[PDB]
A paper describes a structure:
Influenza viruses which belong to the family of Orthomyxoviridae have three antigenically distinct types of virus, A, B, and C. [name] viruses contain three surface proteins: [name] (HA), neuraminidase (NA), and a proton channel M2. Among them, we determined the structure of the HA protein from a 2009 pandemic virus A/Korea/01/2009 (KR01) in complex with the Fab fragment from GC0587 and compared with the KR01 HA-Fab757 complex structure. In this context, KR01 HA structures in complex with GC0587 or GC0757 reveal a distinct epitope in the head region which was not reported before. Overall, our results strongly suggest that residues Ser110-Glu115, Lys169-Lys171, and Tyr253 of HA provide a H1-specific epitope and both HCDR3 and LCDR3 make major contributions to antibody-antigen interactions to achieve the epitope specificity.
The structure from small rhombic crystals (0.02×0.02×0.05 mm) of KR01 HA-Fab0587 complex was determined at 3.1 Å resolution. The asymmetric unit of the crystal contained four copies of HA-Fab0587 complexes, where Fab binds to the head region of KR01 HA resulting in a linear arrangement of the complex consisting of one Fab, two head regions of HA, and another Fab molecule. The KR01 HA-Fab0587 complex structure demonstrates that the head region of HA molecule is stabilized by antibody binding and the invisible stem region adopts different orientations relative to the head region from what we have observed in typical HA proteins. A total buried surface area at the interface in the Fab0587 complex is 1,029 Å2, of which 48% arise from binding to the H-chain and 52% from the L-chain. First, the main chain of HA from Thr72 to Ser74 moves closer to the Fab fragment in the Fab0587 complex and interacts mostly with LCDR1 from Asn30 to Ile33. Notably, the side chain of Tyr103 in the Fab0587 complex is in a favourable arrangement for a cation-π interaction with that of Lys171 of HA, and Lys169 has additional interactions with the main chain oxygen of Gly102. Our results thus suggest that the conformation of the HCDR3 backbone in the Fab0587 complex is too close to interact with 1918 pdm HA, causing steric hindrance.
Author numbering:
A (entry chain B): 2 to 134, 138 to 222
B (entry chain A): 49 to 270, 414 to 427
C (entry chain C): 1 to 210
Write the structure that this text describes.
């Protein structure tokens, strides 16, 4: 029961094509679809395509420009996204349709997302700085500074493993026409730093970069 | 016993908009109607096959109103929002039947029409489509451009090819257009096929159903049958 | 457009039941049918089917979740409200027609008063090679949200440099981020002090001079 999409950034008016991938079988029959989630709120469904007698359903705010297709052997559906307005930047959840029984009620599940982004502002991978410090407690709270990146999303993993605890932040766009900046933190036993290695990895997939550096004691 | 409060079976299953609402689900022995006469079919016309339809809708397990093809996107090439009429109005505004879409011309010329539903899940799928008969060739060309135009419903278990008969019938609800109503049934095997250069009122809603056999108690003019026994004649 | 709309955003302890509700323009019921299919989104990652057709609870979903309503208006209800729910719930696509997403509700969960637990930080060497100077002070794990200020012991407007942004947490209120941002070997002292005020009568954390 699986779902896999993609695409990053477009300088508006360009065309894009979001792929999607299925495993969880029987793809030859099912209906499938996308729902982009608008930022700041999120809104709605951008196409509904059928299994047989191929028929295509759209939003009247979409209808002209989008083409939704599928292949049944390599077993993918796509969204060809055309003539793009700043209005439509969202993330795209690829999603199927549980029909069986009579009606066609709804979609049981949807792929992680892919953030399609519409802007003229060139891609920028994040500057990566560590954050380290006094009075000794029980648990020590460290951090990782990710600064000035564009656009979206970004992923801060602390060397895989110590990701329990580990809150993250919601990027501000420091008022430059781009370049988000988010801040991440651990809370970890005092006795794990000054001994254990604590790394802080960040992936930004659109700029095609993933990086980490040990946050070093001062 | 399914019992309609606002209208006869014409307008209810077509969706005349005094009809709308209805009741809670379906498995029903037989229909009961609150009988409109002058008010039954909205935009004036003959309901073909209406009494056979009277009894296929009698003993029924379930029902589904589903979007056969959605009004919106199903028809890339035909102007899908323009037909609505005073004959079938609502809120004082000029409405049309819920379960079908009156398809008038998009920007003057009307190409061949391709649409089809291919069934899968076995239940009896009831598809309905009206057929419109312009008052005059004025009423005619300004709606479906081809003055020589037809309608052909493909089946297997059905085939018919229609054709408009244009003439001015007397006024019914100020309408010298007259329409015709037809209902096929596609079983789990079949793949329905529509097509036309005009005069078609295409389905929006349509029904998956399952029947048995039954009924028999109704109004003069206008499972539980024999069971095993009941608790008297046999075991006690 | 065929549009639904919710009973906004209100909030509950993790005590028990709240009702998000839907109001559909037309009737989306025929019957033995209905339509509305509830979806939950975790505020900061992907969608979840809970209740579909108002009534039937999606196998795989929690029990606490319940729903019912006739055809025009609907209601979602999660009875023993859990720390786990708390996520931006939608109301869905109605019939088959143009398919329309109601737009959502927040659902905030009310815990005991907490914290902050302030953490400060100097800027790193490599930010500083680049002329960057920013100072990060974490606030994590409070409740409610909070008032933050800096003490550089100078008089400038308020201490400018727009900073903040935050989250919600599956288990508390978490984590106000606030940072000051300036240039090179500049700034002034080594003095920048978060006075983190909340429902507390103070939470001072001093910078360093060293
Ligand atoms: Ca009725």
């Amino acid at each position: 029961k699986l779902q896999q999409s993609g695409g990053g950034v477009v300088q508006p008016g360009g065309s894009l094509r979001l792929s999607c991938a299925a495993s969880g079988f029987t793809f030859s029959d099912y209906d499938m679809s996308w729902i982009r989630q608008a930022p700041g709120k999120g809104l709605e469904w951008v196409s509904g395509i059928l299994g047989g007698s191929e028929r295509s359903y759209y939003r009247d705010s979409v209808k002209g420009r989008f083409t939704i297709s599928r292949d049944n052997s390599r077993k993918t559906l796509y969204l060809q996204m055309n003539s793009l307005r700043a209005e439509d930047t969202a993330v795209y959840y690829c999603a199927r349709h549980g029909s069986p029984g009579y009606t066609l009620y709804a979609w049981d599940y949807w792929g992680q997302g892919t953030m399609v982004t519409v802007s003229s502002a060139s891609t920028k991978g994040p500057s990566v700085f560590p954050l380290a410090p006094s009075t000794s407690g029980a648990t020590a709270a460290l951090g990782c500074l990710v600064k000035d990146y564009f656009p979206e999303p970004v992923t801060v993993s602390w060397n895989s493993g110590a990701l329990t605890s580990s809150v993250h932040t919601f990027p501000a766009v420091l008022q430059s026409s781009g370049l988000y900046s988010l801040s991440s933190v651990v809370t970890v036993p005092s006795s794990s730093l000054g001994t254990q290695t604590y790394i802080c990895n960040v992936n930004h997939k659109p700029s095609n970069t993933k990086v980490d550096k040990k946050s070093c004691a001062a | 016993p399914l019992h309609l409060g606002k209208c006869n079976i014409a307008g209810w299953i077509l969706g005349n908009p005094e009809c709308e609402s209805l009741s809670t689900a379906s498995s029903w022995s037989y229909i009961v109607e609150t009988s409109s006469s002058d008010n039954g079919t909205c935009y004036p016309g003959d309901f073909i096959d209406y009494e056979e339809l009277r009894e296929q809708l009698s003993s029924v397990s379930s029902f589904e109103r589903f979007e056969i093809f959605p009004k919106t996107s199903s028809w890339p090439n035909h102007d899908s929002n323009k037909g609505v009429t005073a004959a079938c109005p609502h809120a004082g505004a000029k409405s049309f039947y819920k379960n079908l879409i009156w398809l008038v011309k998009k920007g003057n010329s009307y190409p061949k029409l391709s649409k089809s539903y291919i069934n899968d899940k076995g239940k009896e799928v009831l598809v309905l489509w009206g057929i419109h008969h312009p008052s005059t060739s004025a009423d005619q060309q300004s709606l479906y451009q081809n003055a020589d135009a037809y309608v052909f419903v493909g089946s297997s278990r059905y085939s018919k090819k229609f054709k408009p008969e244009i003439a001015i019938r007397p006024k019914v609800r100020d309408q010298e257009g007259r329409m015709n109503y037809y209902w096929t049934l596609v079983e789990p095997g079949d793949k329905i096929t529509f097509e036309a250069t005009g005069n078609l009122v295409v389905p929006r809603y349509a029904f998956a159903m399952e029947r048995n056999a039954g009924s028999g108690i109704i109004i003069s003019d206008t499972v539980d049958d024999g069971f095993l026994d009941i608790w008297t004649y046999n075991a006690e | 457009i065929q549009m639904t709309q919710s009973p906004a955003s209100l909030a509950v302890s993790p005590g028990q039941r709240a009702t998000i509700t839907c109001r559909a323009s037309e009737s989306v019921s025929n019957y033995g049918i209905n339509f509305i299919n509830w979806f939950q989104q975790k505020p900061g990652q992907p969608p979840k089917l809970l209740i579909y057709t108002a009534s039937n609870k999606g196998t795989g979903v929690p029990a606490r979740f319940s729903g019912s309503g006739s055809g025009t208006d609907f209601t979602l209800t999660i009875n023993p409200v859990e720390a786990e729910d708390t996520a931006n719930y939608f109301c869905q696509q109605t019939k088959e027609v143009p398919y329309t997403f109601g737009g959502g509700t927040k659902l905030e969960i009310k815990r005991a008063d907490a914290a902050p637990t302030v953490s400060i930080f100097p800027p790193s060497s490599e930010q500083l090679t680049s002329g960057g100077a920013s100072v990060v002070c974490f606030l994590n794990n409070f409740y409610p949200k909070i008032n933050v200020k800096w003490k550089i012991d100078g008089s400038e407007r308020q201490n400018g440099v727009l900073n903040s942004w935050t989250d919600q947490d599956s288990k508390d209120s978490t984590y106000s981020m606030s940072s000051t941002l300036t240039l090179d070997e500049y700034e002034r002292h080594n003095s920048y002090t978060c006075e983190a005020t909340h429902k507390t009568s103070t939470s001072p954390i001093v910078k360093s001079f060293n």
